[PDB]
Ligand binder design. Structure first.
Ligand code: PGW
Ligand code: NV8
Ligand code: SOG
Ligand code: SOG
Ligand code: SOG
Ligand code: SOG
Ligand code: SOG
Ligand code: SOG
Ligand code: NA
Length: 297
């Protein structure tokens, strides 16, 4: 008789959760394999092709290294947490994995910043600072040094406490998380991305002669990369400011809605690592050639 009520309960209790888990696991697995393969191909492309060993491509290889760190270590953990909302990797990985995720984000945004800086001095203010690949290696090492150092507090606050275990930041007072997460948002997101936007805007005014055509191609590619980065990282950055600085989502009226929003934001962060190699494949003929050689083999 009441078949419609039975169908509604079947959708809520079985059909919807099953489809939700399927889409979640499929999106994560697809991003995982695509990111691993494409970033490994970025590194292989610049290692086999000596003519692609430019300062920009060296920084892009570093960006692929940071994306591979995130994708290989943190992505499976983020997937399992978005599934169970609990921590199953133990007290030590509770510090290590979030630490490596934050270090990956810092290396990513600092690498994009240094690419924007190299392009801005090369195009807008030439002949002030020499930019060489060998100095790019030192800039990359310093990027990793700074990133590993400044994310130590992130590791220090992580704790894995019994409830099943939960891994989360532990704060002795209400003010410290607000100050720290304000600084985290401004340093890893807003400030570098706003400065990169102003730099690339000046580069666009300057560029728009074989060198100018090659520079237009590479600058269009780098602008796309920065834009997709800002888009992929906006949701999680805003949600963490709202949670940690404004105290939102403490209520559990629709706890599943908060879980879905945070889950999609985590997945967007991991999707950026899969996106970047595809961007090089469509906006760089040289990367596209090396990727074609990889797929043919
Ligand atoms: C995290 C720390 C580590 C970062 C790592 C380093 C990152 C390195 C990246 C890039 C460096 C290159 C920067 C490029 C130089 C900056 C580019 C620039 O000068 O833009 C100016 C315009 O600004 C303006 O209106 C005034 C600026 C208004 C800014 C409002 C938004 C602020 C937030 C945004 C971030 C602020 C951060 C500040 C940190 C000190 C000049 O305009 P222009 O004459 O051409 O035409 C005028 C026309 O726009 C009038 O409408
Ligand atoms: O919202 S974040 O996720 C974030 C991430 C990226 C950009 C912006 C914000 N976030 C806010 C600041 C400190 C941090 C805490 C949690 N960390 C983490 N826990 C993790 C648990 C499992 C796997 C990876 C993990 O990474 C990563 C860094
Ligand atoms: C991999 C993660 C999959 C979980 C997706 C969450 C979907 C929750 S629907 C959930 O179904 C329950 C009965 O099963 C009801 O009691 C709840 O009221 C209703 O909200
Ligand atoms: C005009 C040249 S400026 C010059 O540029 C060099 C680049 O390396 C630096 O080594 C020097 O210190 C600096 O004076
Ligand atoms: C917030 C981050 C601001 C960073 C400003 C400094 C940029 C690093 S320059 C780079 O430093 C390396 C250190 O190892 C040297 O080896 C290289 O020769 C040199 O090119
Ligand atoms: C870019 C990828 C970032 C991944 C972020 C993982 C979020 C973990 S936060 C913390 O995780 C606990 C499980 O340990 C949950 O029970 C809590 O509800 C939640 O607050
Ligand atoms: C701005 S944060 C705000 O400042 C208060 C002081 O008035 C503190 O109690 C808390 O940190 C918070 O409510
Ligand atoms: C660099 C340091 C920056 C600290 C920023 C603190 C911002 C104020 S939080 C404030 O707390 C209220 C308590 O009632 C909440 O109701 C509001 O949602 C929220 O606006
Ligand atoms: Na990324």
């Amino acid at each position: 008789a009441s078949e419609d009520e039975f169908l509604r309960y079947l959708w809520r209790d079985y059909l919807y959760p099953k489809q939700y888990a399927w889409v979640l696991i499929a999106a994560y697995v697809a991003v995982f394999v695509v990111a691993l393969v494409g970033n490994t191909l970025v590194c292989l492309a610049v290692w086999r092709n000596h003519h692609m060993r430019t300062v920009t491509n060296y920084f892009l290889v570093n960006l692929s290294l940071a994306d591979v760190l995130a994708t290989a270590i943190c992505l499976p953990a983020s997937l399992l947490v978005d599934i169970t909302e609990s921590w199953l990797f133990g007290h030590a990985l509770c510090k290590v994995i979030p630490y490596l995720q934050a270090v990956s984000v810092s290396v990513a945004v600092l690498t994009l910043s240094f690419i924007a800086l190299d392009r801005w001095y090369a195009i807008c203010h030439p002949l002030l600072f020499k930019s060489t690949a060998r100095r790019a290696l030192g800039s990359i090492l310093g990027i990793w040094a700074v990133s590993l150092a400044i994310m130590v507090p992130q590791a220090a606050v992580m704790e894995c406490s019994s409830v099943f275990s939960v891994c989360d930041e532990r704060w002795a007072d209400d003010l410290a998380p607000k100050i720290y997460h304000s600084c985290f948002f401004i340093v890893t997101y807003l400030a570098p991305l706003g400065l990169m936007a102003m730099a690339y805007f000046q580069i666009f005014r300057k560029l728009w002669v074989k060198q100018m055509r090659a520079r237009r191609k590479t600058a269009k590619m780098l602008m796309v990369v920065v834009l997709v980065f800002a888009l992929c990282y906006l949701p999680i950055s805003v949600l963490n400011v709202l949670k940690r600085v404004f105290g939102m989502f403490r209520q559990a009226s629709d706890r599943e809605a908060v879980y879905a929003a945070f889950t999609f934001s985590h997945w967007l962060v991991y999707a950026n690592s899969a996106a970047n190699p595809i961007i090089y494949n469509f906006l760089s003929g040289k990367f596209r050639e090396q990727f074609k050689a990889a797929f043919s083999w």
